[PDB]
Amino acid sequence: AKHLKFIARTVMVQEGNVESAYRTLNRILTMDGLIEDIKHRRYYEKPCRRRQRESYERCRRIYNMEMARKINFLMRKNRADPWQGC
Amino acid sequence: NEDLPISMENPYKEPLKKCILCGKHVDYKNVQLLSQFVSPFTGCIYGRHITGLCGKKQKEITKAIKRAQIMGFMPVTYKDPAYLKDPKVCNIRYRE
Amino acid sequence: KNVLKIRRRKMNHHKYRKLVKKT
Amino acid sequence: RFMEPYIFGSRLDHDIIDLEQTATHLQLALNFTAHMAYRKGIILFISRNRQFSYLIENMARDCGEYAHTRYFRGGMLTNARLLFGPTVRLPDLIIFLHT
Amino acid sequence: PRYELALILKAMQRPETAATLKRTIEALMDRGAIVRDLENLGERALPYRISAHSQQHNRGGYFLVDFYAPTAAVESMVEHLSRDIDVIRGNIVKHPLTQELKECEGIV
Amino acid sequence: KNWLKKFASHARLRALNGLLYKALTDLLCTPEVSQELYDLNVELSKVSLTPDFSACRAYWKTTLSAEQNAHMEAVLQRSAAHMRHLLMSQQT
Amino acid sequence: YHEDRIRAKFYSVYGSGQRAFDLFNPNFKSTCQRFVEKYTELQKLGETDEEKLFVETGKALLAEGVILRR
Amino acid sequence: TKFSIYPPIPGEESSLRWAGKKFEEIPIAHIKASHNNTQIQVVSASNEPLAFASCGTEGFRNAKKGTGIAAQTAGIAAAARAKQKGVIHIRVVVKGLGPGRLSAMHGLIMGGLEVISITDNTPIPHNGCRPRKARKL
Amino acid sequence: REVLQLQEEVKNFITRENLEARVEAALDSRKNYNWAITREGLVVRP
RNA sequence: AAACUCCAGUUGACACAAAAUAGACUACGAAAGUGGCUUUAACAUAUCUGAACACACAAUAGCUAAGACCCAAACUGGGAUUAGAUACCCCACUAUGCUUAGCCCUAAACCUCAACAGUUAAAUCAACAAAACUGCUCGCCAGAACACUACGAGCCACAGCUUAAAACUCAAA
Ligand code: FES
Ligand SMILES: [K+]
Ligand SMILES: [Mg+2]
Ligand SMILES: [Mg+2]
Ligand SMILES: [Mg+2]
Ligand SMILES: [Mg+2]
Ligand SMILES: [Mg+2]
Ligand SMILES: [Mg+2]
Ligand SMILES: [Mg+2]
Ligand SMILES: [Mg+2]
Ligand SMILES: [Mg+2]
Numbered sequence: 055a056k057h058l059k060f061i062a063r064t065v066m067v068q069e070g071n072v073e074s075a076y077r078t079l080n081r082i083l084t085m086d087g088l089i090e091d092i093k094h095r096r097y098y099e100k101p102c103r104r105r106q107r108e109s110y111e112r113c114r115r116i117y118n119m120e121m122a123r124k125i126n127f128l129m130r131k132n133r134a135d136p137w138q139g140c
Numbered sequence: 141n142e143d144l145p146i147s148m149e150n151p152y153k154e155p156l157k158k159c160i161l162c163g164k165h166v167d168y169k170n171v172q173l174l175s176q177f178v179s180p181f182t183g184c185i186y187g188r189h190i191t192g193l194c195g196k197k198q199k200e201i202t203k204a205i206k207r208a209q210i211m212g213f214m215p216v217t218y219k220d221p222a223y224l225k226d227p228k229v230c231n232i233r234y235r236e
Numbered sequence: 237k238n239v240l241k242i243r244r245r246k247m248n249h250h251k252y253r254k255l256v257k258k259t
Numbered sequence: 260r261f262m263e264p265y266i267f268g269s270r271l272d273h274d275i276i277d278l279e280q281t282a283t284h285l286q287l288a289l290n291f292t293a294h295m296a297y298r299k300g301i302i303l304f305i306s307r308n309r310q311f312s313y314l315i316e317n318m319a320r321d322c323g324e325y326a327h328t329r330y331f332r333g334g335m336l337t338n339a340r341l342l343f344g345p346t347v348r349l350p351d352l353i354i355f356l357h358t
Numbered sequence: 359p360r361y362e363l364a365l366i367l368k369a370m371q372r373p374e375t376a377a378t379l380k381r382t383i384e385a386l387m388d389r390g391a392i393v394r395d396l397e398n399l400g401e402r403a404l405p406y407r408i409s410a411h412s413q414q415h416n417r418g419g420y421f422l423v424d425f426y427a428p429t430a431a432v433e434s435m436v437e438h439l440s441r442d443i444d445v446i447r448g449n450i451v452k453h454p455l456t457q458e459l460k461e462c463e464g465i466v
Numbered sequence: 467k468n469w470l471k472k473f474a475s476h477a478r479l480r481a482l483n484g485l486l487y488k489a490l491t492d493l494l495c496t497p498e499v500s501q502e503l504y505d506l507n508v509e510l511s512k513v514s515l516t517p518d519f520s521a522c523r524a525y526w527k528t529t530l531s532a533e534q535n536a537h538m539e540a541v542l543q544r545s546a547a548h549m550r551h552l553l554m555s556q557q558t
Numbered sequence: 559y560h561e562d563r564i565r566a567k568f569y570s571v572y573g574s575g576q577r578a579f580d581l582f583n584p585n586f587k588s589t590c591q592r593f594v595e596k597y598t599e600l601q602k603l604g605e606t607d608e609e610k611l612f613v614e615t616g617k618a619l620l621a622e623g624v625i626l627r628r
Numbered sequence: 629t630k631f632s633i634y635p636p637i638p639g640e641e642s643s644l645r646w647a648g649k650k651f652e653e654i655p656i657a658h659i660k661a662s663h664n665n666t667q668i669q670v671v672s673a674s675n676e677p678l679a680f681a682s683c684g685t686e687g688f689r690n691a692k693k694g695t696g697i698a699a700q701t702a703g704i705a706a707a708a709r710a711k712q713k714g715v716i717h718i719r720v721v722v723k724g725l726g727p728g729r730l731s732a733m734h735g736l737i738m739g740g741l742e743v744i745s746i747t748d749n750t751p752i753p754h755n756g757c758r759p760r761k762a763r764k765l
Numbered sequence: 766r767e768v769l770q771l772q773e774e775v776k777n778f779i780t781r782e783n784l785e786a787r788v789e790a791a792l793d794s795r796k797n798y799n800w801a802i803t804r805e806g807l808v809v810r811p
Numbered sequence: 812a813a814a815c816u817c818c819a820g821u822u823g824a825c826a827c828a829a830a831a832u833a834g835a836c837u838a839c840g841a842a843a844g845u846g847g848c849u850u851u852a853a854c855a856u857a858u859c860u861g862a863a864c865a866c867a868c869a870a871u872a873g874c875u876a877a878g879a880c881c882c883a884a885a886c887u888g889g890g891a892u893u894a895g896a897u898a899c900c901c902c903a904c905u906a907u908g909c910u911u912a913g914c915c916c917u918a919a920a921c922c923u924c925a926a927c928a929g930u931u932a933a934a935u936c937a938a939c940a941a942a943a944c945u946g947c948u949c950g951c952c953a954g955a956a957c958a959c960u961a962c963g964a965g966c967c968a969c970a971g972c973u974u975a976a977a978a979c980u981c982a983a984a
Contacts, residue, residue: 094557099557429851680820754832756829757882760883
């Protein structure tokens with residue numbers, strides 16, 4: 055309200071590609087967490103539910119990264135069998 | 141026997157990794173530095189997974205940013221356009 | 237855990253609060 | 260853990276096996292194997308390392324002994340009578356090149 | 359202790375700015391302060407529009423006053439900075455140099 | 467709560483269908499789920515809840531190309547759980 | 559081992575030798591190993607100043623004709 | 629010259645011109661995309677209202693207002709009423725995440741106006757007013 | 766050492782006598798605290 | 812459908828409310844709790860244990876006085892649905908959530924792990940939870956239900972809180 059306008063969350067259109075500018079703006083707002091914040095602020099989330107959700111997402115991310123690391127580490131052995139037959 | 145191994149700290153121990161701001165002072169008046177860790181479009185403070193800073197310097201940067209914002213040194217809703225052409229130190233790409 | 241015991245505690249307490257209200 | 264007494268040390272996070280102990284252990288094992296072969300006992304080599312299955316089978320055939328480098332089915336030793344016959348003779352010595 | 363006063367003053371001409379700075383430093387000294395040095399950071403556009411003393415400001419002069427004052431002075435100075443009409447925004451902080459630069463061995 | 471261990475181990479129906487259809491369309495309007503899904507521009511025809519509320523079937527319009535249809539199916543099947551999580555997190 | 563310290567400093571100053579290691583040879587001599595042997599000989603035939611030993615060992619190896627790029 | 633997504637700064641002079649006018653002189657189309665209705669208002673750089681159109685002013689009623697077609701029609705009507713006042717280039721400022729967020733701009737483009745920049749100004753409190761309770765449907 | 770450093774530093778402090786001149790000089794000066802950091806950890810001074 | 816149309820959009824001024832992002836951090840505090848900025852005070856003890864009652868504290872809810880009131884909202888109305896709706900959905904609005912001075916003293920107040928010190932050796936070990944134990948101290952427990960009850964006592968509490976039985980009954984729980 056007290057800030058200068060047309061600086062925040064603003065994307066310029068290149069060669070009349072308005073759809074591309076909109077999709078870039080959507081990507082920016084989603085990456086900065088603004089979209090999920092707006093969607094979550096429509097109704098009040100109770101503090102206990104918020105803490106449970108944050109813990110769940112944190113542990114989900116940790117577990118997913120660890121499983122991805124394990125799969126990538128064990129993917130090296132997936133080559134042609136060098137001792138076929140024996 | 142002279143060839144037996146001797147007790148010793150690892151001489152090949154590599155120096156422990158450092159963050160880009162380690163050993164440097166973070167001041168709330170240095171808006172140019174604090175602007176390198178905020179989103180150009182929203183002014184939101186980047187997390188450590190993007191900035192790559194350590195916990196101590198991440199906290200220092202956060203506190204300095206809040207102090208500068210509330211004391212009338214830094215904008216809140218966007219990054220100052222004067223610092224848009226500064227070196228990029230954050231691991232984030234909008235394909236923009 | 238005993239959910240019957242907690243449900244028994246709930247029924248006993250609720251019945252008690254009805255009695256004090258009545259009398 | 261049980262391999263610790265046989266480890267000379269760790270060289271840049273790589274364990275080194277004390278070869279002085281290995282010499283005595285190998286001496287005892289080879290003496291036992293030679294004595295068992297002298298008594299005409301059945302000797303069975305076992306190893307699931309497919310890189311050396313051919314070599315171990317060739318060696319077993321060469322020395323007139325037996326080899327099992329393939330998938331080990333349930334009960335080959337503890338149920339040998341049902342799997343080979345009521346009068347089968349089991350090995351008198353088993354040598355694991357890979358345990 | 360040692361304090362730094364960050365002062366955002368109204369965008370005025372040189373005489374009024376000098377008078378305001380003199381008045382601020384004089385108040386500091388009256389409250390028992392020993393002023394070490396005065397820095398000028400420049401006249402610049404504010405990060406946002408600031409409403410003070412029934413006036414809207416988009417531009418302002420930034421100044422730093424380093425000083426040594428007793429602990430009881432700071433509160434009083436704040437109240438004084440609240441009454442000065444030529445001050446858009448005054449904030450007293452503990453001097454950053456007094457804060458110790460603890461050394462780090464790196465990411466554990 | 468040791469998430470490590472857990473991870474390792476009718477008029478009402480029509481209203482709920484409409485609400486879920488709107489919510490799923492809004493979710494697909496953005497990269498909130500994933501950028502790969504957003505680039506596909508998936509469109510939904512309807513949402514049907516089973517009579518016993520054991521499953522939610524979202525009918526998505528297919529395109530003419532078959533490779534694109536297969537890619538869309540793969541991405542949607544890989545994204546379904548994340549959309550469920552988002553729907554409950556937003557308190558829809 | 560003691561020489562490991564020297565090796566570390568060598569591997570930190572002159573870096574890894576452009577010459578490749580031949581681990582099949584039981585008596586392979588790397589540039590770092592020759593530096594170590596010269597360092598120990600100098601220590602046994604002189605004083606104990608770690609920096610001076612390093613610099614004089616470098617001078618001696620360059621005199622022999624072994625390239626050493628810092 | 630490399631294209632810059634970042635809008636020109638009024639202070640810093642730039643060469644970007646649209647029909648001879650600078651960035652800060654272009655009219656602004658304010659779109660409010662609510663959950664059940666969409667509003668479009670075109671204003672000048674000095675905040676002089678030139679055109680206004682919503683889904684309700686174009687005849688749509690009740691749930692028909694909260695659709696893409698209604699927002700497109702409102703955008704077309706606003707574009708027509710703005711072209712009748714000399715508007716060609718516009719800067720779009722969208723507010724809200726309603727169904728008419730993109731359809732209103734589609735209508736504006738289809739009505740003859742050229743979009744030079746898109747801005748989002750959806751109200752995001754830094755945790756101010758407490759929102760209503762979740763529905764128990 | 767600290768006391769001597771403080772004693773020599775006090776010579777440049779602002780007093781009631783030099784307030785006019787020091788205010789004027791500060792008004793005719795500009796201090797800059799801005800500096801950027803690079804990915805290599807180097808300071809880029811403006 | 813009701814409701815509003817002193818309505819709605821842009822712009823400008825404008826809180827005794829709440830404190831995006833940072834936080835993918837795991838810190839402070841005895842616990843309860845604590846996540847906008849500045850400043851002043853300030854986080855006990857160089858043996859350990861030591862209380863339903865002593866001395867201090869204790870989320871949310873609740874009771875007295877005054878004040879503030881954006882938003883939310885038990886309750887209360889209106890609209891809709893339904894066989895009915897004294898609920899769920901929509902609108903409006905209270906007590907209350909806020910400040911000040913007093914009370915009330917309860918929570919799945921839980922890491923469902925009492926405080927200090929020590930060990931990783933034994934068959935590790937009913938099971939599950941959260942690897943198994945040792946020394947020392949305080950508190951507590953001896954079938955289920957009756958019973959977070961009755962009576963007595965204490966309490967700023969008066970449909971309240973703490974402590975807390977017995978009779979009858981059963982072979983289980
Ligand atoms: S790594 Fe040392 S201060 Fe961050
Ligand atoms: K718990
Ligand atoms: Mg004690
Ligand atoms: Mg007692
Ligand atoms: Mg209380
Ligand atoms: Mg209260
Ligand atoms: Mg708790
Ligand atoms: Mg105790
Ligand atoms: Mg006790
Ligand atoms: Mg009993
Ligand atoms: Mg009682």
